[PDB]
Structures are given as structure tokens and as C-alpha cells.
């Protein structure tokens, strides 16, 4: 449908400039390493990683975190606001412990993605933009995640779970809320992008070093 979220900040007791946020000393070492990657005189190029680092330490991006990143990298806070609002992986509102993203683009839609989405909805009892009352699961829909060959699939906190059926996704959910962590990858006895059965190519062992090198080199 539409975006639903708002791109204006209204102050709130849980989200305001006085909300406590700061980087851990190890996170400060990581920030130093990040900033060292870019040429001197260009430190704004580090707003993308550092901001992400903040969202990794805190779980989301409060306005104080954006202000802290702006202060650290010595850039106007509006530039950090623009980056934070432009990119969709930045959470400007708290999410659940396990952020579930279900691809619903056409290659995934063809392989019955709606079945996966409704299975998740009926397992968790929440809608497409809500969080569970225990704040353990946040479900949303996303565009193509680059795993179209292994459709349908979902992403849960930097992990891909591919070749899903409603039973597989329900098992992943009920095992995740038990305190464990399901292994990523396809759930169809394929564990790759290979053809479903047969391995029509690359059957022969790969050739040795210098196999086809041209003469004179």
C-alpha cells in the first residue's frame, strides 16, 4: 500500500534529544576503524556505517542517536536525518527482537508468497505492520531481497530462510521463540541455488591451477 510511517519527528518521552544514547568504547574503536577507511577531508562518507552501528547497539535509531552520529562525524544533523529517513533498513521506531521481512515482489509472488505471509499472520496473531505484545516479533513486507531463485523466502535479523512452506515458516517461528536460533538457508534439502534435483552442471571436478593459461604468460 502506502508508506504508513511518517517522515517528521514529534518529540516524545521515549524519543527526544535528552534520551540517553552513547557508544560503547568498543563501538568507538569500531567507529575509528570505519572512519579510517575514507580519505582525509571526507568524513561524511562514514555516516552510513556508523549510523548502522548505532542501530546495532540500540536496536533502533532514536533522534539522540542521529544527533550523536552528527556530532561525532562533525556534519550538520539534517544530513544525518536525511540519510536515516531515506534508507529503509534504519528503524526510526522500536521494533521487535526478531524483525521478520517477507518478500512479496513478483518472482516471490509467483511462488505462493501469500501462503507464507498468512501462515505467519495466523501463527503470531498480528498484522503486516504490528508488533507482538511481548515485543518479540515484528512482521513487515519488503521488496526483492535478492534470493528470487530460492523463492519464497523471509529474512529474520540478517539471516535468509529460503524455499519456505507454511509448515517450515511456522517451525522457524516456534523454534525462534523457544530461545534457539534456526539455521539459515533453504528448507528444501537444497542448501544452495542449485537446481532442485540433479545438479545439471558443474558435475566434473574443477580444473587445476593454470589449466587454460595462454602462452607467453
Amino acid at each position: 500500500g502506502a508508506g504508513g510511517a511518517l517522515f517528521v519527528h514529534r518529540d516524545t518521552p521515549e524519543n527526544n534529544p535528552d534520551t540517553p544514547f552513547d557508544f560503547t568504547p568498543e563501538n568507538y574503536k569500531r567507529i575509528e576503524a570505519i572512519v579510517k577507511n575514507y580519505p582525509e577531508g571526507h568524513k561524511a562518507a562514514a555516516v552510513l556505517p556508523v549510523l548502522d552501528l548505532a542501530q546495532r547497539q540500540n536496536g533502533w535509531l532514536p533522534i539522540s542517536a542521529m544527533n550523536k552520529v552528527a556530532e561525532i562525524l562533525q556534519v550538520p544533523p539534517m544530513r544525518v536525518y536525511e540519510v536515516a529517513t531515506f534508507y529503509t533498513m534504519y528503524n526510526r521506531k522500536p521494533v521487535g527482537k526478531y524483525h521478520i521481512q517477507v518478500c512479496t515482489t513478483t518472482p516471490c509472488m509467483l511462488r505462493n508468497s501469500d501462503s507464507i505471509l498468512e501462515a505467519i499472520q495466523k501463527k503470531l496473531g498480528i498484522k503486516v505492520g504490528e508488533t507482538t505484545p511481548d515485543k518479540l516479533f515484528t512482521l513487515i513486507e519488503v521488496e526483492c531481497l535478492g534470493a528470487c531463485v530460492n523463492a519464497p523466502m523471509v529474512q529474520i535479523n540478517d539471516n535468509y530462510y529460503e524455499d519456505l512452506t507454511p509448515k517450515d515458516i511456522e517451525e522457524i517461528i516456534d523454534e525462534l521463540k523457544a530461545g534457539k536460533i534456526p539455521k539459515p538457508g533453504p528448507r528444501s534439502g537444497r542448501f544452495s541455488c542449485e537446481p532442485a534435483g540433479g545438479l545439471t552442471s558443474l558435475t566434473e571436478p574443477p580444473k587445476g591451477p593454470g589449466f587454460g593459461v595462454q602462452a607467453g604468460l
Binding site: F86, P107, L110, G146, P195, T200, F211
Partner: protein, 433 residues
């Protein structure tokens, strides 16, 4: 015998990506066992002119989707130094719906990518390579970091890379969920800590690129095939495919196929042979085929009558009015609502538009609303021609090519499936009086 007329059956010995399915060790030792990092020092000592010529004669074209001749594009950066550092930027955004090849290259053959970065940077005189990987590919990015760590410890990259006296660094930079950041200027802006909004051209990145320095933006596969082209000859590369359509290609067959998969194949393979041999054929048989998008969502679709004899290269698919794109083949049989699929693609483009320029920012959302009404038949037959004219107004008038890629699927749907639109229109008309 020279001048082959049939393509689509190449043996494993000629496949560049020999660990596409991740059945071997993706680390340094396995890659060296498979022939990676072989005679890299000699290749570097040959000189940038030799590498540029070897890429030129191979007839390689850009694998990102545009199909630009790689030799000329990489030779655009053969200018002399003017005080600014030179950089190479590898495009690993991988945002096209239907494309899954660069992901497998990075997660299974990262050392090919690192070696290609070194070789291409030497060819262009680049000081360092920035690899802009998709933000969702966290495991792939960490695998690439492990490979780069191994290359640094082994002395293959860094100070005195491979012992050639050439210093070269490889950095990995992660985006945060923006398909537009696959555009080369949008990617450059995203590296610089701004919004993923494309720049206008001219200037081209060879003049003013990242940090305002000379830059070349290349795809993951284009860079990764560079060391193999340098080693096995380049003239060997040209022996595959038709003229100006040379080499091997990675295809992602998805949708309504028995076994969707990522495969490597000779460039000019016929589409039907590709679908039957590797994908296992269309679901319900070839007679059940309805439509195919041959090169990812940005390309116009084709019906079954065109898919019978079409070749999967740039020129043949241009002659079919669809283009090759990223060679991601999405297959839809006769049991799908094709209007709904194209509307979902238009909604994707609506949600991925950066909003910088007027034609994209307004017209793509307008097209999204029109197609949402078309799906239900809530329109009239004159609105089909109206939508065609709207799409023609968007196309060719935007800053970047996201507007073109939003217009093209609509034009293909109108061109080949107008009767379905009119039938839905009349069904909705008589159903609601």
C-alpha cells in the same frame, strides 16, 4: 569448424565460475586449488595497456544490464594523473527483482572478485577498490571480508600487491536497503554519505566520480571475469556466443519452472533450450507457458510465440523489443494473473523511486494507481492509450534509468496483452452495471 550457428552447450572446463553452487572451499586455499590468484604478478607486470587490450579483444560487455563494451569503458580511465587519486567501485547492490547471481559470486567465489578488483584497478590505475555490497547481504559481506583478510595476510592485496610493486586496497561498504543505490552515480553518492540520488551526466565518473575523483563503476560479474579473461586469453572468451554477444553468462531462472536455479551458459543460448535443459521446463509443460520476462523486471515481457526461437543475447532480445538486462528469466505460465504481476512490478518501482526528478517521482506513482485500477478492471479502454502516453512521457525524460525501467514493463503488457485488459474492463463494467 569456425562460425558456429548453435550455442547453449558448454562443458565445465569452459565455465568461469567453477564453485557457483558452493560445493568447494570458498576460502583462499580452495580458490588457489581451483586456479585463482595464478600468475597475477605476471599479469600485473604486463601493464595496464595489455590488460585493457585483452579486455577489448574479448568482446566483453557490461554484465550489470546495460551491455556497454567493457574495454572502452575501462580505457576511459587511462588518463594521466592530475593530482587526484583514482578509485574503482564494484557494484554489488543487486537490486533487480529476479537477479541472484552476484550474491552467489560473492558468497561462494569471493576470491575471484578480489583478484578481479586488483586486476581492474591496475588496468585503470586505481589506488583502491570500494565494493558496495547490498545491506541485506550481511553474511555475504562478512564472507567477502574474510576473503579480503586472507588476501591481506597472504600478501595478494595491500602494500606491494602480489610482489608487483603496485599498492592496492579493497574496502567493503554496506548500503542500507535502497534499490536505486545500484545506479552508478546513486551508488557513488551513497558511498559519500548522502542520499542515493543519482547525479546527471556529464560529468561521467571517469572525470568526476567518488569523492570528486576519477572512478569506474563495474558489476560484480564483470570484474570477476577479468582475471580469467586475462589468463585464458581473451580471444578464448570471444569464441563463445554470437558476434558482439561473446562469452559466458550467469542466468537466474525463476518463477513458474519446475526447478528454479542459477546456472552458467553460453551467451547466445536459445531461451527455450535454457528453460528446458537447466530449469526443468515450464510447470505443466512448455504448452502451458504464457509469458517470460527475459532480463529482470526492467525489461518488457514476451509471449510464448516469441519465446519459441529467441536467442538470449543483447542484440537478439533487442530485436524482440525487450533487451537482455541482467539475464534473469522470470517465467509465468497460463495460470497466473499477468496484469497483477506487472502491477506488482510497477508497485515495486513506485516504492524504489528516489523521488529526485519530476517524471519518475510523479509519473511512476500515477502509473501505479492506474495499474491498480486496471487489475480490478475499474477503468475504460481509452485509459490504455492514456497510460501508454504517460509511460512515453516518463521514458527518456528522467535523470536516471529507473523511469525507463518503470515504463518498459507497462509498454510490454500493453503491447502483448491489451485484449486481457479490455476483457477485464468489460467484465467489471457489466458486473457493476
Amino acid at each position: 569448424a569456425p562460425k558456429k550457428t548453435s550455442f547453449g552447450s558448454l562443458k565445465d572446463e569452459d565455465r568461469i565460475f567453477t564453485n557457483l553452487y558452493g560445493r568447494h572451499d570458498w576460502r583462499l586455499k580452495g580458490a588457489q586449488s581451483r586456479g585463482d590468484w595464478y600468475k597475477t604478478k605476471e599479469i600485473l607486470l604486463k601493464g595496464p595497456d595489455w590488460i585493457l587490450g585483452e579486455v577489448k579483444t574479448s568482446g566483453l560487455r557490461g554484465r550489470g544490464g546495460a551491455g556497454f563494451p567493457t574495454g572502452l569503458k575501462w580505457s576511459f580511465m587511462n588518463k594521466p594523473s592530475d593530482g587526484r587519486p583514482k578509485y574503482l567501485v564494484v557494484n554489488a547492490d543487486e537490486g533487480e527483482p529476479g537477479t541472484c547471481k552476484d550474491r552467489e559470486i560473492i558468497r561462494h567465489d569471493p576470491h575471484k572478485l578480489v583478484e578481479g578488483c586488483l586486476v581492474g584497478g591496475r588496468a585503470m590505475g586505481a589506488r583502491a577498490a570500494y565494493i558496495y555490497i547490498r545491506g541485506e547481504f550481511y553474511n555475504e559481506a562478512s564472507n567477502l571480508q574474510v576473503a579480503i583478510r586472507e588476501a591481506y595476510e597472504a600478501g595478494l592485496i595491500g602494500k606491494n600487491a602480489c610482489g608487483s610493486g603496485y599498492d592496492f586496497d579493497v574496502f567493503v561498504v554496506r548500503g542500507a536497503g535502497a534499490y536505486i543505490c545500484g545506479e552508478e552515480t546513486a551508488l557513488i553518492e551513497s558511498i559519500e554519505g548522502k542520499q542515493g540520488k543519482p547525479r546527471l551526466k556529464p560529468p561521467f565518473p571517469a572525470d568526476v566520480g567518488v569523492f570528486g575523483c576519477p572512478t569506474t563503476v563495474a558489476n560484480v560479474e564483470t570484474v570477476a571475469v577479468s582475471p580469467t579473461i586475462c589468463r585464458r586469453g581473451g580471444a578464448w572468451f570471444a569464441s563463445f556466443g554470437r558476434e558482439r554477444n561473446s562469452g559466458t553468462k550467469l542466468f537466474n531462472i525463476s518463477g513458474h519452472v519446475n526447478h528454479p536455479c542459477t546456472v552458467e551458459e553460453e551467451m547466445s543460448v536459445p531461451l527455450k533450450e535454457l528453460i528446458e535443459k537447466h530449469a526443468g521446463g515450464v510447470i505443466g509443460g512448455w504448452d502451458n507457458l504464457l509469458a517470460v520476462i527475459p532480463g529482470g523486471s526492467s525489461t518488457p515481457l514476451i509471449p510464448k510465440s516469441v519465446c519459441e526461437t529467441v536467442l538470449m543475447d543483447f542484440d537478439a532480445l533487442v530485436q524482440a523489443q525487450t533487451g537482455l538486462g541482467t539475464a534473469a528469466v522470470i517465467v509465468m505460465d497460463r495460470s497466473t494473473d499477468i496484469v497483477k504481476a506487472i502491477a506488482r512490478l510497477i508497485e515495486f518501482y513506485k516504492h524504489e523511486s528516489c523521488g529526485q526528478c519530476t517524471p519518475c517521482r510523479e509519473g511512476v506513482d500515477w502509473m501505479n494507481k492506474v495499474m491498480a485500477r486496471f487489475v480490478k478492471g475499474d477503468a475504460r479502454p481509452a485509459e490504455i492509450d492514456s497510460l501508454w502516453e504517460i509511460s512515453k512521457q516518463i521514458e527518456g525524460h528522467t535523470i536516471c534509468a529507473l523511469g525507463d525501467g518503470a515504463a518498459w514493463p507497462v509498454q510490454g503488457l500493453i503491447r502483448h496483452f491489451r485484449p486481457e485488459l479490455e476483457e477485464r474492463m468489460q467484465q467489471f463494467a457489466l458486473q457493476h452495471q
